[PDB]
Amino acid sequence: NAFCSQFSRGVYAIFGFYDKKSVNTITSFCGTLHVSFITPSFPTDGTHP
């Protein structure tokens, strides 16, 4: 709901952190809504757009 709040506001990119228990919530949404996501957290394994 913090993701969908800012996507309701309209943004061009989102900076933020994820964790292990939330990483697939991020990598699914950024694949879907095509909103880029810059982050310093641990690297996801795979080829994520």
Next chain:
Amino acid sequence: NSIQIGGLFPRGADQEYSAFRVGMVQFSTSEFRLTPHIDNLEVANSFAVTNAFCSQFSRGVYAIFGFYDKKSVNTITSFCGTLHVSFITPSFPTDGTHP
């Protein structure tokens, strides 16, 4: 009366949905009846897992049947712990405890 539940089924999961209908016909009663709402989805896409979840919370279901994968296991447990809806599943068990 007629009660409403929600169903989350993977594409390619033919037999389990066939096993779902056999269970409904046999365990049906005359007094109280259960009404499913079935959805077919990819289960690794956690958007679609989220999209199927909030669509059925808009329906006002009483409990939810569904599966999950490694990609979506955290999506369900964070939702059902928050939105206080029960989720029954044949998937692999979550490590730790989740309400």
Next chain:
Amino acid sequence: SRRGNAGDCLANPAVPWGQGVEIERALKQVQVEGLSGNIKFDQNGKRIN
């Protein structure tokens, strides 16, 4: 400048916006210098060099 209103995240069907494809290609084609050193990216989003 997609001044058209983004709407919610729960769209049926959820639709992207093609100027989002423009953003990440700029984000991957950045080689600057920072605190860690040479910031060189891949097509994936991971760091190299």
